[PDB]
Amino acid sequence: AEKCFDHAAGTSYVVGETWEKPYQGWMMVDCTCLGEGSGRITCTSRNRCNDQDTRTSYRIGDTWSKKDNRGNLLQCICTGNGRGEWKCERHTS
Numbered sequence: 001a002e003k004c005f006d007h008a009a010g011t012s013y014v015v016g017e018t019w020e021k022p023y024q025g026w027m028m029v030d031c032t033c034l035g036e037g038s039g040r041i042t043c044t045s046r047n048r049c050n051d052q053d054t055r056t057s058y059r060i061g062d063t064w065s066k067k068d069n070r071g072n073l074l075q076c077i078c079t080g081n082g083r084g085e086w087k088c089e090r091h092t093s
Contacts, residue, residue, distance in 0.1 A: 002035030013041070023050075028057040049078030049086030058086065 003012035006021055013019055015035035021043060022028045029045035050057040053066040060080035066088055067073045074088030 002033075002039065004031075004033030004035065004039040004041045006031055006041060022057075026050075026055045026057060027052075046083040047080055049076075049080070049084045051076065051086070060084075 013033035021031040031043040076088035
């Protein structure tokens with residue numbers, strides 16, 4: 001039973017396990033254990049859209065406005081369709 005201690009989490013995950021692990025501070029992705037030799041963990045966010053503009057990981061079916069780099073406001077949404085395709089649509093007035 002190769003465990004995948006996430007250390008910063010202080011929790012183990014027997015091979016073939018999956019849990020939640022906040023990335024930087026607000027980000028969050030599903031860290032899965034695959035046991036390679038010392039405890040490898042494939043963390044990926046396919047169902048947890050995360051925007052680095054508001055510093056807040058959204059969920060599936062959620063929605064949040066997020067400008068780009070000019071000052072507009074792309075009303076993005078975590079459509080979640082296979083890998084969290086949270087798209088962003090500027091204000092189309």
